[PDB]
Design an enzyme around this catalytic site. Structure first.
Site, short mmCIF file in Angstrom:
data_model
loop_
_atom_site.label_atom_id
_atom_site.label_comp_id
_atom_site.label_asym_id
_atom_site.label_seq_id
_atom_site.Cartn_x
_atom_site.Cartn_y
_atom_site.Cartn_z
N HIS A 82 0.84 -1.23 0.00
CA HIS A 82 0.00 0.00 0.00
C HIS A 82 0.86 1.26 0.00
O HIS A 82 0.70 2.15 0.87
CB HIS A 82 -1.01 -0.07 1.15
CG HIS A 82 -2.13 -1.00 0.88
ND1 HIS A 82 -2.20 -2.22 1.49
CD2 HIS A 82 -3.23 -0.88 0.11
CE1 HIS A 82 -3.30 -2.83 1.07
NE2 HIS A 82 -3.96 -2.02 0.24
N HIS A 100 1.80 1.38 -5.71
CA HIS A 100 0.36 0.99 -5.82
C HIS A 100 -0.43 2.20 -6.32
O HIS A 100 -1.24 2.07 -7.24
CB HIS A 100 -0.09 0.46 -4.46
CG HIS A 100 -1.55 0.22 -4.44
ND1 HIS A 100 -2.13 -0.75 -5.24
CD2 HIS A 100 -2.55 0.82 -3.77
CE1 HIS A 100 -3.43 -0.80 -4.96
NE2 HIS A 100 -3.73 0.18 -4.08
N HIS A 122 -5.94 7.43 -3.35
CA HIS A 122 -6.98 6.56 -2.75
C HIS A 122 -6.44 5.84 -1.51
O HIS A 122 -7.26 5.36 -0.76
CB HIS A 122 -7.56 5.62 -3.78
CG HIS A 122 -6.75 4.39 -4.01
ND1 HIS A 122 -5.61 4.40 -4.76
CD2 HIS A 122 -6.91 3.13 -3.56
CE1 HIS A 122 -5.09 3.17 -4.80
NE2 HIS A 122 -5.84 2.36 -4.01
N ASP A 123 -5.13 5.69 -1.33
CA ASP A 123 -4.58 4.96 -0.15
C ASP A 123 -3.56 5.85 0.61
O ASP A 123 -2.74 5.32 1.36
CB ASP A 123 -3.95 3.64 -0.56
CG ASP A 123 -4.86 2.40 -0.65
OD1 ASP A 123 -5.82 2.28 0.07
OD2 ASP A 123 -4.52 1.52 -1.41
N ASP A 166 -8.24 -0.73 -8.41
CA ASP A 166 -7.61 -1.11 -7.13
C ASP A 166 -7.11 -2.52 -7.14
O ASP A 166 -6.08 -2.78 -6.40
CB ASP A 166 -8.55 -0.92 -5.98
CG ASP A 166 -7.82 -0.62 -4.67
OD1 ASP A 166 -6.57 -0.44 -4.70
OD2 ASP A 166 -8.51 -0.57 -3.66
N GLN A 190 -6.18 -17.77 -3.27
CA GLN A 190 -6.25 -16.97 -4.53
C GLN A 190 -7.46 -17.41 -5.39
O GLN A 190 -8.20 -16.51 -5.90
CB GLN A 190 -4.90 -17.03 -5.23
CG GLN A 190 -3.83 -16.27 -4.44
CD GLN A 190 -4.16 -14.80 -4.47
OE1 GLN A 190 -4.12 -14.17 -5.51
NE2 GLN A 190 -4.52 -14.23 -3.31
#
Ligand SMILES: Cn1cc(-c2ccncc2)c(C(=O)Nc2cc(-c3ccccn3)nn2C)n1
Ligand SMILES: [Mg+2]
Ligand SMILES: [Zn+2]
Length: 313
Positions: free
Chosen positions: A68, A72, A106-107, A217, A269
């Site tokens: 993050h 990213h 966004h992060d 994202d 996953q």
């Protein structure tokens, strides 16, 4: 005003593709973003001086965490760029401006821990923001940076255009809370299938921008397999640090976050592709047909995780 960014030939061509990887040279990432703004939005959208100052303050407020992080941020903005560029006529000038900026921000100030860990820790942010805790924080950091002297990239918007873009950015950043994705996609699914979906209805456009935000994202699952597989290591490095911190609060974490259960990653996953990623890119592709390469890349990666389970890697 006549000052373009240009990229080397390979990047000038590959940046246009959904599966582009931005590379390991951090000092080229700001330039890559400005490039994308210039082509997506225009050379007049932003004062270059203010945009560069904004980009560098954003970068400084991303932390040195495994996933993050500033890479990213730029990566998520590139996937939005590619969506916008393949859907030229569907989005307004305000939306193109807002959405790349939203993706970059966004992060902001992520610590590498989920909403759920903040609440169990009883972090002060969990008292200020009872839901979408980190996402309300990211939006707060975004407004803070925009109000630094010299950083208001929207200053040349009229008052009501300014209110609209800040509202596009707020909803786009809140939408990156995956807890909200499931409902949003279900509702988009019903609306597309009963044929009520209406891109002139603001509440419907909001839903569609939300799904674009989830798609961007999660875009590590839409790269070529070697990128996706090496990105998974970064994602799990944070999950497993979080699990360690759960065990320090005396709470056994879920297997997703337990470094003792690394053998279960491949099957985890599969669940994630089947429950989140495939459904996300399927509905996105039903609403915006030129985003199909994201769904095709995602399915290719599911097939690679199925080969990991069958021992063939
Ligand atoms: C928000 N986000 C991005 C990714 C992701 C994306 C790309 N590569 C790796 C993880 C994931 C995820 O894996 N999610 C995820 C992993 C597992 C799991 C369960 C048991 C054992 C190991 N992993 N469960 N879930 C829900 N969630
Ligand atoms: Mg986030
Ligand atoms: Zn993110």
């Amino acid at each position: 005003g006549l000052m373009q960014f240009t990229l080397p030939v390979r990047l000038c061509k590959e940046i246009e593709l959904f599966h582009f990887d931005i590379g390991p040279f951090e000092n080229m990432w700001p330039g890559i973003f400005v490039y994308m703004v210039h082509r997506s939005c225009g050379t007049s959208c932003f004062e270059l001086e203010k945009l560069c100052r904004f980009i560098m303050s954003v970068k400084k407020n991303y932390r040195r965490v495994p996933y993050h992080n500033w890479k990213h941020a730029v990566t998520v903005a590139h996937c939005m760029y590619a969506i916008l560029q393949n859907n030229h006529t569907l989005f307004t000038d305000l939306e193109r401006k807002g959405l790349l900026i939203a993706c970059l921000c966004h992060d902001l100030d992520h610590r590498g821990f989920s909403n759920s860990y903040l609440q169990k820790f009883d972090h002060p942010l969990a008292a200020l923001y009872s839901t979408s805790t980190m996402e309300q924080h990211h939006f707060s950091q975004t407004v803070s940076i925009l109000q630094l002297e010299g950083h208001n990239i929207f200053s040349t918007l009229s008052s009501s255009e300014y209110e609209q873009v800040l509202e596009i950015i707020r909803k786009a950043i809140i939408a990156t809370d995956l807890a909200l994705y499931f409902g949003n996609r279900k509702q988009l699914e019903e609306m597309y299938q009963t044929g009520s979906l209406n891109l002139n209805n603001q509440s419907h456009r909001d839903r569609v921008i939300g799904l674009m935000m989830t798609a961007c994202d999660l875009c590590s699952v839409t790269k070529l397999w070697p990128v996706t597989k090496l990105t998974a290591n970064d994602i799990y490095a944070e999950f497993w640090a979080e699990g360690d911190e759960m065990k320090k609060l005396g709470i056994q974490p879920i297997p997703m976050m337990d470094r003792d259960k690394k053998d279960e990653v491949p099957q985890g996953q599969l669940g994630f592709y089947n429950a989140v990623a495939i459904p996300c890119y399927t509905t996105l592709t039903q609403i915006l047909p030129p985003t199909e390469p994201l769904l095709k890349a995602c399915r290719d990666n599911l097939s690679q995780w199925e080969k990991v389970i069958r021992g063939e890697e």
